[PDB]
Design a binder for this molecule. Structure first.
Ligand SMILES: OC[C@@]1(O)OC[C@@H](O)[C@@H](O)[C@@H]1O
Ligand SMILES: OC[C@@]1(O)OC[C@@H](O)[C@@H](O)[C@@H]1O
Length: 91
């Protein structure tokens, strides 16, 4: 709880960058697409965050893993807004 905790992903050649910050129990998103940093649409509960992303042709897919206690919730971006993913784990 001494400092915020971040996770970062990027794609393409511009590039696009997404940086997720866990702070005081919530995870927010800052975005770069070549022109300046702006606040993204992702905001969900969590004390810890990790991220991965992959391209399928021209489509970006992002997975954000948000954890509180022993429960990790996966959030998915597949072109049409964030949706909850199927990830589970018994921690
Ligand atoms: O505005 C850019 C945006 O749509 O890019 C994809 C995701 O990173 C979203 O949370 C974000 O708002
Ligand atoms: O399209 C969503 C989904 O199927 O993508 C692959 C994995 O991230 C799954 O947990 C997730 O539900």
């Amino acid at each position: 709880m001494k400092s915020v905790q971040t996770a970062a992903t990027s794609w393409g050649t511009v590039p696009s960058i997404r940086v997720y910050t866990a702070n005081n129990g919530k995870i927010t998103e800052r975005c770069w697409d070549g022109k300046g940093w702006y606040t993204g649409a992702f905001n969900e509960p969590g004390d810890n965050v990790s991220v991965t992303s992959w391209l399928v042709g021209s489509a970006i897919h992002i997975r954000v893993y948000a954890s509180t206690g022993t429960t990790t919730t996966e959030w998915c971006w597949d072109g049409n807004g964030w949706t909850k993913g199927a990830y589970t784990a018994t921690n």
